[PDB]
């Protein structure tokens, strides 16, 4: 709802691409990772998502990882 804290996030690939997401602060990042792989034509097993150098787990949320609005998640291809 409009009463949640939504956080804007940028997902930046090593290929230069920057894709935007907006999700609630307590939403598991699996939501974003699955969406990203589906929409950008990538497979989960071939890419790795990291934030401030640490890999992001399925149930990690922006709030849990202490993300702030407009933070960037890095994507590496494997």
């Amino acid at each position: 709802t409009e009463n949640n804290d939504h956080i804007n996030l940028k997902v930046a690939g090593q290929d230069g691409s920057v894709v935007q997401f907006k999700i609630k602060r307590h939403t598991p990042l699996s939501k974003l990772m699955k969406a990203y792989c589906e929409r950008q034509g990538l497979s989960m097993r071939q890419i790795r998502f990291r934030f401030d150098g640490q890999p992001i787990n399925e149930t990690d949320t922006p709030a849990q990882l202490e993300m702030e609005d407009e933070d960037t998640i890095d994507v590496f291809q494997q």
Copy 2:
């Protein structure tokens, strides 16, 4: 041309994704809906586009729907 009113629009999926479009104010939204389905790997029959709760028809234009620059179109998956 540079003499038209171009409107920036955000298309926000229920999956958290936010995809940007820029089209002239009198352009039918079919342009955006087809482009979105092609580029994001979605099929038209499986997604529904709405603006301020109302479904968007093929020939509806941002001007006709009284959209403003930076408005958001919502996408639901079916």
Copy 3:
């Protein structure tokens, strides 16, 4: 690294889509063109990339083409 000049670029298709990239100023635009075709579901032979009306070659870089931060590259479908 953080000591390079990274340039934000927008790639605007004739279909209204606007896709964002961030690459170093001396990086060949082949990086962006390949990424764009892969992610947006397009084939290189079917699209043409231009900047200020001139086609972009594989090894052209934003700096070489005298691009500035937030410039737009145009994409035409063939």
